[PDB]
């Protein structure tokens, strides 16, 4: 009987309040109940109203935006309009009671009035209201009004007019005393421990321990720290219910098992919402003190309590390694079956999976996953729902949408939950709540077990028809409207679990979500927050231990123990992990993020980029060293054969002295570049994935920070490092220059980031709108220009992804959530084919399909969901770009012949250098594939001719230098 | 001779480079066949496991199921048919003189991952059954090389099937079973009672030797051909289903279009991966690193084989006793996700 919410324990205060509440109802007088949350106003009135056959309860929850039409909608299914107008209840014997919860919550307008408050005082003082659509007076005859509210001193509570409270009797209910709480909850614990008669004598210490833990949590964790640190006896009832569930679905228990189970339940009830690690350690010490002083057992940390029903038929504590392996295999199956994501599983992920599963097993079990973006909220929700067999329904809310689409989605979800008995997990993101009416719908759905506003009139009639048909299909004997709708709301409560995903709790919309009275007292708040450094260490080791890592000498530095969060350093892998974690911490600290959650998406992206880049670079370096070594060996063998033992061979041997010297120099420097390969691979990966949204000065500053922190952990790097020389190839450089890049290294660097992001779609923040023309030149006529602000964009994008054309979407600050599955690269592989879901119907991915997002508005509005997945790249003009453009303009408008000659000479020089480089590549390939002598002589003669041409062409540079020195003053005044 | 129970420890251990997904027993000579997550198709004997008989890589992806059959003719070889995740089914020829693998042909046509395969011989004619993620079961002709029937028995995709003459039953992802008459290609009955997707389903073949679930009830239902079908799913349960009698091209009875809970059994800690029938005993394993043996008479787990594999155990099977041409020998082989296999002798 613990799970039934209608149970009460009659104390002195409970029976006193219940009797006076019943007497105030029977006096035909309005009642307003005032008290802090969890006082028991709802409990006493429910208790007083089950013991009467003359009254009926109608539950309305008021939010920040409640209107008169909501109160009317909650009653038309309960009341009949008769013209004797007169709004009588449908029943003829029972009266009606209007439970209006949180009367103080509806806001004032700009002239200091509340609509629903004046409506309620009209309902009680004047006994009726004017029906708006046809302007007639309807007289309320048998409806009473009961108000429940909090004191106005609480935040979010606003003063209430005395013209309202003139007609309403007011009762105040305080929190019960500690002795009363101990008695009530020792009765609860006796009821729980009836299942275990061996430990029936421990009920009173457990109840006193729970009450003491409650009091210490309420005193220590007050609203002054965080806005949601509100504790109530409802928390303790939830703790009791969880204890009963885990006892009922568990094996034979010991006293130590009881202590560990109760501690785990207290962890999942009280300490789920704790933000700081200091408060977590405080709760750990508080649990230790409570156990030591009340119940005189191993470590009782959060991660040391891993209770789960996955590994057996019963709920019991399990080991860490077997649980991790089971979750890894289940997640591999999940990636094979639903969606493929490259995710590795860590211990805090395991704990989050366990607590999400614990909440989802419960009847009326909801969630509020609060934490940073790319933490693993919705993917772990889907994984846990797939483990439980739930059906994932993510609402298809996008731009140019209204309340109608949300109403249809929720109507279909409720119909599938009730009529089709399909168990459903409903995942609501913070970006899927566009208007405050969306919050009103969510609050009405969670507070009650329905939304009375959607199903009214002919919708109510077709609901009745469908439910009679479904009940006759199931063979259940019921005829009345009340029993049928009770079955309806019971099915809704049983087969629907709404999960909330919040990425930025500081935002006003998310603050309204958290502070909503029904979204707070019904949901299970799960503040995962930003990843702790232990999680970063686990994921980093797990995702860099699969690459060939140890190939160079390493000396372990003597560093402070406090700054090292991983295992003690033994090879370069732990050094790499510590370097990446420390740079993530420093990057998020310098950007002044404040108390805002910090997204680990940069860390994961840098980890993956480092993995792929070190793999490619090591493959290229090994191939190049093998080619150089076999070429040098072949040359030495040919020289030895010539010495032991005709003019063409001698000339080829003599001419290749410079190539032999270059090969020897590269062989000598192979050790040097293998020393610095890991360091500059790390630098390149972080420089690609972290500095995309940064200007040149802070990029240089954080590069200095990265170099210092890299030298701290004894990982060598290139002293003469340059990102353009390490990633931007010369072929790509010329392609970009002919496509329309600026000569500035910042723009080439940015486009190098853009092209070298094969996993994340790039965000082109270009106010000048030049990169669109550049990429349109890049892909020729294959490219297509779309926009988020145009009509028919969905069909254009679908045709573009069917054909495989490269897409540029303009107006990036108007992001359309229908392409979210393209944004997160959620691709379903249909054998050799790739398919993706866009909008409402799936579409195929050709394979040459590329996605680009462009936006010409600086300081725009990029959602955190879009912000955390895209390689956002700023294209902001700087010193050198202004100088170059001004110099080019004044040269074109002063002497166009000299400028044309200069640019043609530069193009010819770079083309000759590219031809030279391809020519040494050709010589290396030819010597690796060993007629040939004549071809080699011809290529050597071509190299000599091109070198002489370049030497002849290099005689006009001082004139350009003189022009630079002459027009530098114009350049600097322009800047 | 039919009450054989395996011991508590295998006598040989098989080492495979990758995880084993399916195994099959040769009805005539002591050779077991081993799968590979890398896609290889091994061949191991029961006396010298240190060296394979044959090995090849014809599938670009891992395989899902295997089956073999030795055909008979009143007017003679062992045929190997294997389905993989490479959008193709490869049929192989097993020679006995030199004991190598020979490739016959490759089957194409399925839209997505093919998962199960069934082979039967009737009236000197052989066909190959196949189901995939294309929510359509496709039965092809080995000799002609073309498909013979294609229909949709379930809204979602079908994972496992079995063939008993002119009837075929399908196990899909939507927790419901469908019995369809193959030549007519129409649904006959639906079965509800499962909450998790089906993994493997097969018929309870009639045997004559007093098993409750392997004997017919009445004369007409004896003439029907079969009585019960056994199905394993991911709700850690194996359920025995009572097939209603249709109107006898069979016609579905409007008042008898639903199955019946003849017997449901529990005791596995994770998803039951496979099932097999031998005498009065049913053998099964799951993801809980365990192998069971559930008696059909009392419906109680007689013997628990715990911790045979470090990781998941996927496949096990026995010899067919319902067929006169196949001698039900006392060989058992189990294959697991831990890249090892266990073979039980005597
Ligand atoms: N006999 C009792 N006396 C006092 N409080 C009780 C008694 N029985 C239960 N409670 C507590 O009162 C709480 C009811 O609070 P509730 O009415 O939901 O808060 P609110 O007034 O904000 O709606 C329950 O969580 C329960 O723990
Ligand atoms: N432990 C992890 N290892 C690797 N990648 C991860 C991990 N956790 C999250 N991710 C990344 O996060 C993405 C899913 O995050 P998601 O749950 O969608 O975040 P949000 O809920 O904030 O939208 C995946 O694409 C994955 O690459």
| Cβ pair A831:B312 closer than 8 A | no
Instruction: Report CA dihedral (A362, A366, A371, A374) to the nearest 10 degrees.
Output: 90
Q: Which phi and psi angles does A714 have, rounded to 5°? A: 60, 45
Residue B265 lies in a domain: yes
Q: Which phi and psi angles does B92 have, rounded to 5°? A: -115, 155
| Cβ pair A832:B87 closer than 8 A | yes
Neighbours of A462 (CB within 10 A): 11
Q: How many domains does chain B have?
A: 1
- How many angstroms separate the CA atoms of A686 and A903, rounded? 35
Residue A812: burial class (beta carbons within 10 Å; 0-12, 13-18, 19+): buried
- How many angstroms separate the CA atoms of A6 and A1, rounded? 9
Instruction: List the single residue in A313, A329, A830 with the smallest CB-CB distance to B312.
Output: A329
Q: Alpha-carbon torsion A486, A490, A492, A497, what sign?
A: positive
Q: What is the DSSP string of A852-915?
A: EEEE--TT----HHHHTTSEEEE----HHHHHHHHHHHHHHHH-HHHHHHHHHHHHHHHHHHHH
Contact of A830 with chain B, judged by CB distance below 8 Å, is answered with yes
Residue B235 lies in a domain: yes
CB under 8 Å to A371, separation ≥6 — which residues?
Answer: A377, A502, A503, A527, A528, A529, A530, A597
- How many angstroms separate the CA atoms of A702 and A700, rounded? 6
Helix (H) or strand (E) holding A258: helix A255-269
Helix (H) or strand (E) holding A121: helix A115-125
Residue B3 lies in a domain: no
- How many angstroms separate the CA atoms of A20 and A27, rounded? 10
Distance from the Cα of residue A788 to its chain's centroid? 23
- How many angstroms separate the CA atoms of A917 and A767, rounded? 37
Q: Which residue has the tokens 């019991």?
A: A316
Residue B2 lies in a domain: no
Residue A766: burial class (beta carbons within 10 Å; 0-12, 13-18, 19+): buried
Contact of B112 with chain A, judged by CB distance below 8 Å, is answered with yes
Nearest chain A residue to B194 by CA: give it. Answer: A389
Residue B5 lies in a domain: no
| Cβ pair B111:A830 closer than 8 A | yes
Helix (H) or strand (E) holding A350: helix A347-361
Neighbours of A415 (CB within 10 A): 14
Instruction: List the single residue in A311, A389, A832 with the smallest CB-CB distance to B269.
Output: A311
Test mutation, B301, B311, B314, B339, chain A, max A CBs within 10 A: B311
- How many angstroms separate the CA atoms of A724 and A728, rounded? 5
For residue B226, what are the domain limits?
A: 11-346
What's A455's DSSP letter? Answer: S
- CA A171 to ligand 1 center in whole angstroms: 16
Q: Is there a contact between A494 and A363 (Cβ–Cβ < 8 Å)?
A: yes
Q: Which phi and psi angles does A261 have, rounded to 5°? A: -65, -45
- Lookup: tokens for A966: 């002459």
What's A524's DSSP letter? Answer: -
Helix (H) or strand (E) holding A425: strand A424-429
**Half-sphere exposure of residue A120: CA atoms within 13 angstroms, side-chain side:** 36
Three state DSSP letters for B203-219: EECCCCCCCCCCCCCCH
What is the side-by-side order of every strand in the sheet holding A57-61?
A57-61, A96-101, A143-149, A30-34, A168-172
Helix (H) or strand (E) holding A427: strand A424-429
- How many angstroms separate the CA atoms of B344 and B333, rounded? 6
- How many angstroms separate the CA atoms of A456 and A443, rounded? 18
Instruction: List the single residue in A325, A329, A389 with the smallest CB-CB distance to B195.
Output: A389
- How many angstroms separate the CA atoms of B346 and A647, rounded? 80
- Lookup: tokens for A407: 């109403």
Angle at A28 between CA A22 and CA A30, to 5 degrees: 80
Ligand 1, atom nearest to A237 Cα: 27
Pairing of strands B198-204, B228-233: antiparallel
What is the side-by-side order of every strand in the sheet holding A841-845?
A828-830, A833-838, A841-845
- How many angstroms separate the CA atoms of A743 and A730, rounded? 14
List the one residue out of A239, A221, A220 whose CA is nearest residue A229.
Answer: A221
CB under 8 Å to A10, separation ≥6 — which residues?
Answer: none
CB under 8 Å to B331, separation ≥6 — which residues?
Answer: B25, B30, B32, B46, B318, B319, B343, B344, B345
Residue B65: burial class (beta carbons within 10 Å; 0-12, 13-18, 19+): buried
Q: Which residue has the tokens 């309902």?
A: A123
Q: Is there a contact between A231 and A218 (Cβ–Cβ < 8 Å)?
A: yes
Separation in Å, CA B287 to CA A51, A249, A380, B36, B267: 52, 21, 21, 18, 12
List the one residue out of A10, A101, A3 whose CA is nearest residue A47.
Answer: A10
CB under 8 Å to A415, separation ≥6 — which residues?
Answer: A466
What's A785's DSSP letter? Answer: E
Residue A163: burial class (beta carbons within 10 Å; 0-12, 13-18, 19+): exposed
Which residue has its alpha carbon closest to ligand 1 atom 1? Answer: A9
Neighbours of A699 (CB within 10 A): 17
List the one residue out of A444, A332, A322 whose CA is nearest residue A74.
Answer: A444
CB under 8 Å to A245, separation ≥6 — which residues?
Answer: A3, A315, A361, A362
| Cβ pair B87:A831 closer than 8 A | yes
* Ligand closest to the CA atom of residue A374: 2
What is the side-by-side order of every strand in the sheet holding B137-141?
B114-122, B125-132, B137-141, B147-151
Helix (H) or strand (E) holding A802: helix A793-803
Q: Alpha-carbon torsion A905, A909, A912, A918, what sign?
A: negative
Which residues face B201 on adjacent strands? B231
Residue A376 marked in a binding site: yes
Q: Is there a contact between A49 and A188 (Cβ–Cβ < 8 Å)?
A: no
Q: How far apart are the first and last CA of chain B?
A: 11
Q: Which phi and psi angles does B196 have, rounded to 5°? A: -140, 155
Q: Is there a contact between B186 and B255 (Cβ–Cβ < 8 Å)?
A: no
Residue B147 lies in a domain: yes
Contacts 24+ apart (CB under 8 A), A920-927: A920/A659, A923/A659, A924/A627, A924/A628, A924/A631, A927/A631, A927/A634, A927/A635
- How many angstroms separate the CA atoms of A789 and A399, rounded? 9
- Lookup: tokens for B19: 């995880």
- CA A502 to ligand 2 center in whole angstroms: 14
Which residues face A309 on adjacent strands? none
3-class secondary structure, A188: helix
Q: Which residue has the tokens 């109203």?
A: A49
Residue A35 marked in a binding site: yes
- How many angstroms separate the CA atoms of A932 and A923, rounded? 10
- How many angstroms separate the CA atoms of A515 and B153, rounded? 50
What's A564's DSSP letter? Answer: -
- Lookup: tokens for A696: 């040149």
- How many angstroms separate the CA atoms of A95 and A933, rounded? 109
Pairing of strands B272-278, A851-855: unpaired
- How many angstroms separate the CA atoms of A163 and A180, rounded? 37
List the one residue out of B60, B69, B192 whose CA is nearest residue A829.
Answer: B60
Pairing of strands A86-89, A136-140: parallel
CB under 8 Å to A243, separation ≥6 — which residues?
Answer: A189, A192, A261, A262, A265
Q: Which phi and psi angles does A708 have, rounded to 5°? A: -65, -45
The total number of residues shown for chain B amounts to: 346
3-class secondary structure, A370: strand
Q: What is the DSSP string of A32-98?
A: EEE-STTSSHHHHHHHHHHT-SS--EEEEE--SS--HHHHHHHHHTTEEEE---EEEES-SSS-EEE
Separation in Å, CA A302 to CA A211, A213, A285, A350: 20, 16, 12, 12
Q: Alpha-carbon torsion A245, A249, A252, A258, what sign?
A: negative
Residue B300 lies in a domain: yes
Three state DSSP letters for chain B: CCCCCCCCCCCEEEECCCCCCCEEECCCCCEEEECCCCCCCCCEECCCCCCCCCCCCCCCCCEEEEEEEECCCCCCCEEEEEEECCCCEEEEEECCCCCCEEEEEEECCCCCCEEEEEEEEECCEEEEEEEECCCCEEEEECCCCCEEEEECCCCCCEEEEEEECCEEEEEECCCCEEEEECCCCEEEEEECCCCCCEEEEEEECCCCCCCCCCCCCCHHHHHHCCCEEEEEECCCEEEEEECCCCECCCECCCCCCECEEEEEEECCCCCEEEEEEECCEEEEEECCCEEEEEECCCCCEEEEEECCCCCCEEEEECCCCCCCCCCCCCEEEEEECCCEEEEEEC
Separation in Å, CA A436 to CA A433, A440, A697: 7, 6, 42
Q: Alpha-carbon torsion A537, A542, A546, A550, what sign?
A: positive
Nearest chain B residue to A328 by CA: give it. Answer: B311
Lining ligand 2 with CB less than 6 A are A 341-344, 346, 349, 373-379, 501, 503, 539, 604, 824, 865
Q: Which residue has the tokens 């797939």?
A: A386
- How many angstroms separate the CA atoms of A428 and A202, rounded? 42
Which residue has its alpha carbon closest to ligand 1 atom 2? Answer: A9
Q: Is there a contact between A522 and A359 (Cβ–Cβ < 8 Å)?
A: no
- Lookup: tokens for B179: 């019995």
- CA A10 to ligand 1 center in whole angstroms: 11
Q: Which phi and psi angles does A948 have, rounded to 5°? A: -65, -40
- How many angstroms separate the CA atoms of A142 and A86, rounded? 10
Test mutation, A386, A831, A832, A833, chain B, max B CBs within 10 A: A831
- Lookup: tokens for A436: 């405050």
Distance from the Cα of residue A588 to its chain's centroid? 17
- CA A394 to ligand 2 center in whole angstroms: 17
- Lookup: tokens for A865: 């969901």
Q: What is the DSSP string of A684-745?
A: HHHHHHTSTT--HHHHHHHHHHHHHHHHHTT----TT--HHHHT--HHHHHHHHHHT--SSH
- CA A22 to ligand 1 center in whole angstroms: 17
Pairing of strands A79-82, A86-89: antiparallel
């Amino acid at each position: 009987e613990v799970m039934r919410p209608d149970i009460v324990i009659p104390t002195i205060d409970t029976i006193k309040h219940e009797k006076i509440f019943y007497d105030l109802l029977n006096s035909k007088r309005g009642i307003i109940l005032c008290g802090p949350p969890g006082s028991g106003k709802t409990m006493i009135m429910n208790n007083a109203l089950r013991n009467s056959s003359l009254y009926d309860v109608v539950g309305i929850n008021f939010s920040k935006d409640t209107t008169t039409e909501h109160i009317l909608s909650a009653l038309h299914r309960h009341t009949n309009y008769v013209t004797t107008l007169t709004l009588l209840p449908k029943s003829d014997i029972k009266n009606l009671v209007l439970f209006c919860d949180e009367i103080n919550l509806p806001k004032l307008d700009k002239y200091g009035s509340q609509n629903v408050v004046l409506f309620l005082r009209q309902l009680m003082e004047k006994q009726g209201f004017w029906k708006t659509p046809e302007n007639k007076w309807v007289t309320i005859e048998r409806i009473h009004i009961v108000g429940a509210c909090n004191p106005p001193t609480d935040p979010g509570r606003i003063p209430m007019s005395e013209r309202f409270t003139r007609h309403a009797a007011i009762l105040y209910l305080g929190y019960p005393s500690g002795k009363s709480l101990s008695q009530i909850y020792e009765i609860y614990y006796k009821a729980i421990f009836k299942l275990v008669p061996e430990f029936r004598s421990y009920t009173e210490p457990f109840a006193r321990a729970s009450v003491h833990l409650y009091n210490e949590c309420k005193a220590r964790y007050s609203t002054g720290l965080q806005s949601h640190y509100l504790f109530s006896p409802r928390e303790l009832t939830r703790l009791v219910r969880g204890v009963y569930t885990a006892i009922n679905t568990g094996p034979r228990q010991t006293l130590r098992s009881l202590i560990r189970l109760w501690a785990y339940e207290a962890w999942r009830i009280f300490a789920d919402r704790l933000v700081g690690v200091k408060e977590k350690n405080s709760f750990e010490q508080l649990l230790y003190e409570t156990v030591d002083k009340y119940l005189p057992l191993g470590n009782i940390s959060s991660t040391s309590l891993l209770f789960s029903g996955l590994l057996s038929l019963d709920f019991k504590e399990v080991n860490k390694t077997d649980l991790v392996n089971f979750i890894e295999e289940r997640f591999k199956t999940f990636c094979d079956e639903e969606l493929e994501v490259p995710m590795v599983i860590h211990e805090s992920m395991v704990d989050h999976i366990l607590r999400i599963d614990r909440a989802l097993k419960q009847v009326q079990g909801h969630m509020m996953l609060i934490g940073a973006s790319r933490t693993g909220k919705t993917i772990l929700t889907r994984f846990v729902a797939w483990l439980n067999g739930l059906k994932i329904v993510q609402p298809k809310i996008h731009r140019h949408s209204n309340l109608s689409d949300f109403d249809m989605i929720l109507k279909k979800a409720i119909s599938d939950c009730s009529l089709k008995e399909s168990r459903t997990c409903l995942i609501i993101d913070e970006s899927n709540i566009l208007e405050t009416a969306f919050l009103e719908r969510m609050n009405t759905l969670l507070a009650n077990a329905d939304i009375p506003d959607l199903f009214q009139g002919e919708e109510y009639d077709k609901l009745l028809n469908n439910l009679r048909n479904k009940t006759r299909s199931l063979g259940l004997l019921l005829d009345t409207e009340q029993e049928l709708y009770d079955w309806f709301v019971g099915e809704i409560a049983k087969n629907l679990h709404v999960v909330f995903t919040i990425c930025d709790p500081t935002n006003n919309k998310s603050s309204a979500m958290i502070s909503s009275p029904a979204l707070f007292n019904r949901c299970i708040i799960n503040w995962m927050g930003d990843w702790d450094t232990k999680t970063m260490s686990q994921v980093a080791n797990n995702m860099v231990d699969v690459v060939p890592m140890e190939f160079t000498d390493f000396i372990v530095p003597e560093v402070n123990k406090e700054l090292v969060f991983t295992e003690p350093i033994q090879t370069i892998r732990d050094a790499v992990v510590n370097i990446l974690i420390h740079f993530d911490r420093n990057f998020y600290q310098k950007m002044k993020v404040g108390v805002n959650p910090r997204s680990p998406g940069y860390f994961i992206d840098g980890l993956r980029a480092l993995v792929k880049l070190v793999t490619a670079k090591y493959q290229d370096l090994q191939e190049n060293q093998r080619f150089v070594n076999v070429g040098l060996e072949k040359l030495n063998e040919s020289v030895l054969k010539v010495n032991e033992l005709l003019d063409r061979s001698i000339s080829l041997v003599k001419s290749l002295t410079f190539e032999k010297e270059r090969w020897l120099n590269t062989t000598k420097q192979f050790s040097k570049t293998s020393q610095e390969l890991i360091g500059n691979c790390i630098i390149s990966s972080i420089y690609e994935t972290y500095f995309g949204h940064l200007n040149e000065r802070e990029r240089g500053d954080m590069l200095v920070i990265l170099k210092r922190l890299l030298g701290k952990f004894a990982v060598k790097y290139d002293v003469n490092y340059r990102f353009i020389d390490y990633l931007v190839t010369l072929d790509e450089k010329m392609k970009w220059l002919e496509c329309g890049l600026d000569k500035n290294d910042y723009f080439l660097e940015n486009m190098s980031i853009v092209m070298n992001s094969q996993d994340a779609v790039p965000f082109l923040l270009d106010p000048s709108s030049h990169m669109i023309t550049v990429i349109s030149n890049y892909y020729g006529n294959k490219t297509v220009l779309l926009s988020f602000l145009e009509e028919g964009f969905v069909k254009r994008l679908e045709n573009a992804v069917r054909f495989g054309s490269v897409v540029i979407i303009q107006d990036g600050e108007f992001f359309d959530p229908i392409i979210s599955r393209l944004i997160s690269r959620e691709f379903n592989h249909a054998g050799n084919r790739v398919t993706v879901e866009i909008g409402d119907h799936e579409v195929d991915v050709s394979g040459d399909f590329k996605l680009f997002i462009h936006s010409c508005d600086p300081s725009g509005d990029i959602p955190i969901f879009l912000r955390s997945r895209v390689r956002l790249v700023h294209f902001v003009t700087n010193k050198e770009s202004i100088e170059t453009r001004i110099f080019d303009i004044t040269l074109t408008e002063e002497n166009a012949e000299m400028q044309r000659k200069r640019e043609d000479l530069i193009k010819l020089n770079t083309e000759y250098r590219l031809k030279l480089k391809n020519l040494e590549k050709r010589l290396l390939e030819e010597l690796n594939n060993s007629e040939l002598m004549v071809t080699l002589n011809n290529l050597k003669k071509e190299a000599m001719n091109i070198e002489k041409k370049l030497s002849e062409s290099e005689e006009f540079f001082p004139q350009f230098d003189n022009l630079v020195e002459e027009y530098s003053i114009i350049g600097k005044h322009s800047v | 001779v039919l009450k054989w129970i395996p011991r508590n420890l295998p006598s040989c251990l098989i080492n495979v480079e990758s995880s084993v997904t399916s195994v099959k027993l040769h009805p005539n000579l002591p050779i077991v066949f081993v799968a590979t997550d890398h896609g290889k198709l091994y061949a191991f004997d029961l006396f010298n496991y240190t060296i394979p008989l044959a090995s090849l890589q014809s599938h670009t992806k891992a395989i899902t199921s295997m089956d073999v059959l030795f055909t008979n003719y009143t007017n003679n070889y062992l045929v190997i048919v294997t389905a993989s995740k490479d959008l193709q089914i490869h049929v192989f020829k097993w020679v006995s003189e030199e004991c190598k693998f020979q490739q016959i042909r490759s089957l194409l046509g399925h839209e997505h991952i093919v998962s199960a395969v069934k082979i039967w011989q009737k009236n000197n004619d052989v066909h190959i059954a196949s189901c995939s993620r294309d929510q359509t079961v496709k039965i092809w002709d080995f000799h002609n090389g073309w498909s013979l029937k294609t229909f949709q028995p379930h809204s979602q995709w079908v994972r496992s099937i079995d063939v008993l003459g002119d009837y075929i039953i399908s196990g899909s992802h939507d927790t419901t079973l469908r019995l369809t008459h193959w030549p007519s290609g129409n649904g006959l009955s639906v079965g509800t009672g499962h909450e998790f997707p089906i993994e493997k389903v097969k018929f309870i073949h009639f045997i004559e030797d007093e098993i409750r679930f392997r004997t017919p009830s009445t004369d007409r239902y004896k003439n029907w051909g079969m009585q019960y079908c056994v199905s394993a799913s991911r709700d850690r349960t194996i359920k025995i289903w009572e097939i209603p009698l249709p109107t006898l091209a069979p016609i579905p009875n409007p008042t008898d279009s639903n199955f019946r809970c003849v017997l449901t059994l529990k005791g596995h800690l994770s998803w039951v991966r496979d099932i097999s029938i031998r005498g009065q005993y049913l053998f099964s394993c799951a993801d809980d690193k365990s192998v069971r043996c559930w008696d059909l008479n009392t419906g109680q787990c007689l013997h628990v084989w715990e911790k045979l594999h470090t990781g998941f155990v996927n496949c096990l099977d026995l010899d067919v006793d319902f067929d006169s041409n196949v001698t039900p020998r006392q060989m058992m082989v189990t294959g697991g996700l831990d890249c090892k296999s266990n073979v039980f002798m005597r």
